[PDB]
């Protein structure tokens, strides 16, 4: 067997894995990143309204 | 299609022909349809959705009841019922405000269960006004 | 010699256990389909759709075992 | 390179070690028997990933603000809240150790598992052809010794907390009288509770290992046996599948460590 | 000779496992059918059709096993 | 000779497993029939019709295993 | 003539699987019968009739396995 | 050497499977008896009278398998 | 020498099979006992009587197989 | 060879079957325990005492096999 | 030759047991999915997401055996 | 030779039983997970938490078996 | 000498079976534990306590079998 | 597999990373989070007393 061919096949397999992660695993993360702050985001503003 | 009746001692809440309905239950709500098995059923706090022939809908909150189903003519013998325009989102907030008061009010476990049911009722009212917007 | 009849026995073990798994997992799944159907004749096509979805998952391993059983048996 | 499928798979399970009694690197085929022969590559990546972890977290922790956090600061405060939530739901004691312990287990095990997704020859190829090292394989949790080292750590914590929070009198009571109550059954009860107690952490370590060793092996198999034009179509589904495994194994090792120390002490 | 003995043993284990799997799989599916019919007998013709539709998939593999068991015993011998 | 030793054992595994599949399959389907009969008597003959329909399908593969175990025993050995 | 020892092993596997299949088969069928009787005790002599009718089918294949295994154990060995 | 040896192995497998069959089949039948007893305890003496009837059928086949097990060990040796 | 040394394996098979049969048949029966107990908890001593009634029948065959296994170890081998 | 290795194999069969039986029997029984404890959360101390009564019987028969297995490994082999 | 004729059986054991485990485990989970999807159809997309998630959990452990089974059969031969 | 050959079979049995045990085990909990969610959709993230708790407990022994399977096959061979 | 091959097989059998029994026993008991939450939301701290108490009993014998299997493979073999 | 000095060497790194995480990483991060939650707490307080 050609070991360089195994590295070729592994390269293509990594590329296609990256392409799935980018489209299905990362955006749930950037969603949750924005969401973490967003879930209690208005909370800080709500505290000042009571003083008003 | 089939017909459903809905009542409480204080009033008839709805009656008429329905292509379909969705109804609260004990282990959560269920869909109901003409072909559904004749399931006599208990009810915890929630709503019923009333989709009449040619697909036109109404959205009723229920305090509680029982959903007998011998026939295709089915009935809900509700303990108390208010529709999603007979209540409003401020009235559902008043129900929630009463629930928050009741949570504050006492230590007793059955009182606490009554307060928790009042919360579930209040959120069911809010949910029915959301269903009414939908 | 002794080698070939033992190959036929190994193929029989793979394709037999595959028969057990594919039969019982669909018996268990189809009974729930039939009770839902008897409860919801209105959603037989919808439930049947879901039934094919999961059926494809149940069959996934047994068909590998069957394809290898045929290989061991006839191609080696 | 003239490696057969099985031969290359071999060299992909072959390991490089350093003999502490001679400081020699270890040959592709001639190991010294002496256990003082450190698995250097897995130590190197293990500690470097743990260093990276502590540098990344300290760089935020020394500056973190309670306004709306920055994009990076948010991704750290998320895992902090996620770990705290898991601890608070399962542990009710006063000890300051348990929450950072949970954190370090989660992030370090996570980063060690993350090595498994890379192309299996990338670093070994560079380490042989650029650096000239006689072997490398990079996934640290894919070797027993680190996972048992972490498990033995947790076992020492389990012992400490079962001794501290309830003493030798209580621990000896629980280990002897349960489950059959009567003093007549003490010799049998010792067997039933002893094998359970000692196997729980050892099982936790090997529980993670039994996933990452097969994980890497599966990538090795797919890269060794199949021709390149069919390697990709069968490798990619395993990589996508193994993402869920790395995430669950990190979560599991954290959660189970909290479960064990909670059930031990309270 | 002994080759026959081992081929008969292989066909026997293949058909035996096929018999267990196929008969218990249909016994479960059919118990569900009979209960759904007892609850309301108006659907017997309908459910008995869905019954055959599912039972078709139950018997797919076991009849491959039987077909090859028979082949081994009568043509591999 | 050595043939009868292994050929009887092959037949024995064949009809033994067939006896498992046929007894467990009819045990489950029949218990559902008897509960249905207790639940709604006077529907016994209708349910019995359905029970014979399903029972014919349950006994299919086990009877082939029986017929071939009889063949191996009283024909091959 | 060593042949005698394997015939006892083959009869042992036939009668062992038959005792498992017919005992768990009648155990499941009778448990459904007892729930039926606990619910409708005035129906018990009717359910006993249906139970004996189904039980005659549960023991069809197992009494063949015991029949031939007892034959193998005495007549052939 | 191995002729008398294997006779003991055949008895071990025969009684082992008969012990699994009788234990499981009575476990299932007695569990449904206990659940009918819990639902209608004042009816227990009748259901108990039905249990003793069904249990005899469950045990009848597992006890002929044991009898032949003792025959293989003591008489055939 | 192998003639007695394998009798330890024969007893191993006999009583290990009995252990799985008994432990699972008692698990099922006691499960239905504990559910009956939860449904009517004033009733426990009566149902527990019926449990001790039928459990005796569950263990009889396993117990004789355990006794014979121990005999095969300590007396014969 | 034949003396020591078979004794370890016998031990392996005795305590592997005892692991199957002791683990599955308590998995089943304890699930019914947790079901009753959910229906009647005032009963848990009572039901757990009943569970210990039943669990003793479940574990007693496998413990014979486990103790004897340890005997076979240390005292005999 | 004598060496290789057993490696196809090591493969057969790994892929048979892993096919039984993965198929029945997914059958158990999927029927519960179709049941809950029958009660509240609005949830069907939500439940479908939970279904594939837990199915990803169930299938992960049995698949490994099939992977090495392909290694053994086509690389070890 | 057998010192080489048998180790592959021993690993095969280790990873076969590991695959059946792990695949069958969590399916029941996954079932109560999906049905419970369909019944009480408000509690889903809570029950999901509890699910993870019991799932990480189901994995210990099958992961012992499979990890040592890969040890037997690759280290000692 | 050949004897070492049988020791790995013996540990293989005893540990594989212990993985079967601990996986299914925790599956069943932990599904009842999850299921118990449906009716009420005031029991997870209690039930999780009881669950660990009974689960401790479920895996103990499997862990003994595995511990002896480990001793056989590493120390004895 | 093979027992080795890695079993001992990795235990040092683990213990030391836990001690440093306990002192440096965890207290400042949790301090920043709780300081935020507290502050969204206090605004909701003022409303009840003022209205009464």
Residue numbers in the entry:
A (entry chain Y), N (entry chain X): 1 to 52
B (entry chain H): 3 to 136
C (entry chain R): 3 to 78
D (entry chain a): 4 to 269
E (entry chain M), F (entry chain J), G (entry chain L), H (entry chain Q), I (entry chain I), J (entry chain P), ...: 3 to 79
Reported in the publication:
The enzyme is based on two rotary motors, termed F1 and Fo, that are coupled together by two stalks: a central rotor stalk and a peripheral stator stalk. The central stalk is comprised of subunits ε and γ and rotates during the enzyme’s catalytic cycle.
The three catalytic β subunits in the present study were identified as containing β1 (βDP); MgADP, β2 (βE); ADP and β3 (βTP); MgATP. Masked 3D classification focusing on the central rotor highlighted sub-states in which the εCTD adopted either a condensed down conformation or an extended half-up conformation. This flexing, in combination with bending in the peripheral stalk, mediates rotation in the Fo motor. When the εCTD is in the down conformation, the central stalk is no longer stabilized by the εCTH1:γ interaction, likely increasing its torsional freedom, and the εNTD rotates relative to the γ subunit. When the εCTD subunit is in the down conformation, εCTH1 can no longer bridge between the εNTD and the γ subunit, thereby enabling the complex to open up to an unclamped conformation and allow a greater degree of flexible coupling between the F1 and Fo motors.
